[PDB]
Amino acid sequence: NVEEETKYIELMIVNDHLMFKKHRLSVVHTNTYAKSVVNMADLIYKDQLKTRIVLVAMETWATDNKFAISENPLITLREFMKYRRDFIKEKSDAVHLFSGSQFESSRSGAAYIGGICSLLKGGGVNEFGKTDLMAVTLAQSLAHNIGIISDKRKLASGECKCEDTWSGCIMGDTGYYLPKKFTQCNIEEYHDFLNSGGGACLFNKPSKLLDPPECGNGFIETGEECDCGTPAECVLEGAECCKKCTLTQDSQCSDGLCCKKCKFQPMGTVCREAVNDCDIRETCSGNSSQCAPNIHKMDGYSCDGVQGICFGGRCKTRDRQCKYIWGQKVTASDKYCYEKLNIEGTEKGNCGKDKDTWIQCNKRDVLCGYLLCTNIGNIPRLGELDGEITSTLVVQQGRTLNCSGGHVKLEEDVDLGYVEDGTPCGPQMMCLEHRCLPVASFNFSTCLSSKEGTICSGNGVCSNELKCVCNRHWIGSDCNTYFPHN
Amino acid sequence: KCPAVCTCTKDNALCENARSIPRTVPPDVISLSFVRSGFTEISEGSFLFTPSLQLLLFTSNSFDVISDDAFIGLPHLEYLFIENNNIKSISRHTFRGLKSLIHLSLANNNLQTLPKDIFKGLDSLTNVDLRGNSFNCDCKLKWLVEWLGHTNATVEDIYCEGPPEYKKRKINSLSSKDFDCIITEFAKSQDLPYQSLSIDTFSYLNDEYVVIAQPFTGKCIFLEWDHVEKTFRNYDNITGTSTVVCKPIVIETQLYVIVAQLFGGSHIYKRDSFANKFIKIQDIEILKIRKPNDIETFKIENNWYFVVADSSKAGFTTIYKWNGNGFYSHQSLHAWYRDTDVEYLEIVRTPQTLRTPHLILSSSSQRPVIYQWNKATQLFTNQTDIPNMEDVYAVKHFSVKGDVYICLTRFIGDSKVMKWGGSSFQDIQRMPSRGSMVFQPLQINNYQYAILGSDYSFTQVYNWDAEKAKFVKFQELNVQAPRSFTHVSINKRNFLFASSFKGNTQIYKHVIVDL
Ligand SMILES: *[C@@H]1O[C@H](CO)[C@@H](O)[C@H](O)[C@H]1NC(C)=O
Ligand SMILES: *[C@@H]1O[C@H](CO)[C@@H](O)[C@H](O)[C@H]1NC(C)=O
Ligand SMILES: *[C@@H]1O[C@H](CO)[C@@H](O)[C@H](O)[C@H]1NC(C)=O
Ligand SMILES: *[C@@H]1O[C@H](CO)[C@@H](O)[C@H](O)[C@H]1NC(C)=O
Ligand SMILES: *[C@@H]1O[C@H](CO)[C@@H](O)[C@H](O)[C@H]1NC(C)=O
Ligand SMILES: *[C@@H]1O[C@H](CO)[C@@H](O)[C@H](O)[C@H]1NC(C)=O
Ligand SMILES: [Ca+2]
Ligand SMILES: [Ca+2]
Ligand SMILES: [Ca+2]
Ligand SMILES: [Ca+2]
16 A cells, blocks of 8 residues: 555755864765765664655755754754755755754754655754764654654553663654664554655655665666665565566566566556545556656645645645644534634634734634634643643534634744644635635646636646646646547 | 501511501501502591601602691601602691601602691701702792791702793792792672673661662662672662662661663662661652763762763753752753763862862763862852863773872773863873773772773773873773673672673672782
């Protein structure tokens, strides 16, 4: 399925000026050192997470810092993401900063939760340390990008504990004896993120690594033809068709989802099923051993039966936000909870706070306001609970409803517990900044269409790459040309 | 009445090829000779039944050993002649019990050595012949020269057969210095099957016990002295999980043990004396201390403190004062750093002539820092770091005369000893070492040693040379992966405890070696 496949994180690393000074002002020293850190983090991910960390690119600042590195990891993370947005042109799944300085916090790095594949979000910042230590810091930063957030709820309950207490676990705090391992709860969090539609960019295998080709690493570099993984592993798949990184007599391929053994899979065979209704199935090209790069529906397609909208391949609803913050057993409150409590302008619901006062929502915006779930805990899975839990009770005509919420802080700015931007407040309407807006207010990009009032001329689906995926018998970039192949 | 093997004169008797020493020898025979005898040894009291002999002769015999007190029961013997025999061993007390012995000859037996005090206790002796033997001159014979000097008896000159340097030299002419034979050493005594992170000692009710932290079982192990066979045995345990450091503290005949764990740990225990079991007293705040690498005990100005180094970025190294009902937080240190080790030392800081309490703690990927306590603020200030030093794990200190030195352990590269100058530590000695997790100074009977542990290599034990003012290579211990070394003193007995992370713990005796 999606979680049985090998996932590949394309990674860029930026070394700041102090990291350059730690190394004696040697570019080769800095770059090879960071290659060592990435190598160890790759050894961590390779087994437990069935995921590989590949370094596509690196740059080091020899002269000075492009922006001032901050002792607060979150501030440095934010400005670093500004840098990579306005400056770095290189294609990567994640861009991480290696800082020679030291953060004034317990966290040795900061990374956005579920950030991968995102231009603004994907990335992290990591303070200087020992190779083995900084490999752990990078491992937990890329874990935060990858969707593994410690269950603050199962931890406080004692549900998720580290099987080995001697070193604890990666998602456990740094100490002299470096954590080598992820909890089973972490792996479950990662599987749940992949099945949720996140991480579509992790499914493509790189070709040219930053280091000269070596036959037998499992990657096809320049000058090779086929590669299986290892001599012992090769026997499982690819040992038949692959000899000394050169194809045998009959093979089109060595290893892959589209390679049956030595031969290609016919065009139109499905290597990957869609994980949700935001996802587009992928078919084997028959020109390639790899499953075609993972793509999903473009942002703005409706999911969950006009209960939510797709962003980055993941469905945004208020119920999934309630389950995200408070755990799976929690469900979102009835719409009447919003339609009543939010217009009051109290701590039990509101549009937000201005000076030490709650704003009462307008009747139009009432679904964009304070997030209300049904039976709530006091310990959110992520972030910091600020204050107490809100519970009111509203009667409708014989049905007594419980409206509960809480203020969960991640960034001093970003606050969970208010309806996430992009959640539908109604037909063709989404929430932005606690207000209910029509779709055109998001200015969505569109694919090609040859027909008035249709997407992909009505014959196809708009992907997140802004290319039309045609239905059967339809061809062309707009899918307007009918070309049956039988 | 004459024994069958022997043929007897009127006053004398002669025994040839006798298979045993006859007990039936008739009285008024004052002389007995054994020649080419069958028996291969002379046991104790063999002659008890023949008290009347004034003379005894042994010639042309092969003897495994002549036992202690073989001649006991011969008060009247003036003359004892052992000559031209093969004798493998001669006991120190063999001649004990003859006061009346006048002439004694060991001559021509080709004896390689003699035991000390073999001539002790014979007053009457006017003559000894040691000639005709091949003597290897060594410690064993070191006494002989001294005896030759102070003896009343007449002894003709005898010569060393060996060693090659001293061969054909008069034993009387020799001086003690030429006998060499000086050593000191550590020898393995006990082997503990359990692997141990750290070891410590304490004195409770004038009894010195030993605490050993075994990480992988989580149990804090206690060893007490047993006189029955071996001085070290395990009386008691404290149960825990992922125990790292176990530090006993005795305050006014009340035992307190601070034990740090990597799981839900950092608990303070006290010994309830009536039940003589340990009871949990306090729990260190889990937010302040998270992954302690270390615990350090010190007492300043009639106050007790202990400080815990936190190698987590999250935890802060914290010092806990004793209010007398227990321990409570005093000062957090080195916030946001990973602290491998904390070390307390009292060092003279110029201009001050008095010694002042100082802390030294070692942060990973960082220079060690020194902290000077200020009495007015009751706290350390003016943070200063050891200059030109990279990547240390621990710092330990020792004093020779008035000056103080520190042993800086660097897991990679050179580990080195520095001397404290007026304002600063100056480089003294640099020893590179491979995977060294400990550098331990020790002082045993005014003997300063420095043990440098190694995982991949041998553990190198060094001795302090007063003339050279540096450590000198001394001995090499084999211990699998030592994290620690600890000096234990029983009464008049000294032991060395070597913990092993990947292997069994080692217990060595402290041995002084002479003759
Ligand atoms: C076939 O593979 C080549 C690369 O060998 C690629 O350039 C081309 O686009 C592929 N065609 C199809 C239809 O996948
Ligand atoms: C609603 O939940 C709150 C706790 O969030 C609780 O105090 C209250 O009793 C609940 N009411 C009902 C009717 O379940
Ligand atoms: C959206 O952007 C397009 C061009 O990018 C522009 O023509 C249009 O006016 C924009 N609409 C809004 C509402 O900003
Ligand atoms: C050796 O003889 C001297 C006198 O010459 C005497 O003073 C001394 O006590 C004697 N020593 C022994 C052990 O008999
Ligand atoms: C100490 O602990 C070990 C194992 O943890 C146990 O076998 C031993 O009997 C204990 N000894 C005492 C004296 O408690
Ligand atoms: C410590 O500060 C005091 C003044 O507060 C000063 O006298 C002393 O020289 C300082 N020590 C060092 C090592 O700078
Ligand atoms: Ca990618
Ligand atoms: Ca290759
Ligand atoms: Ca897909
Ligand atoms: Ca210490």
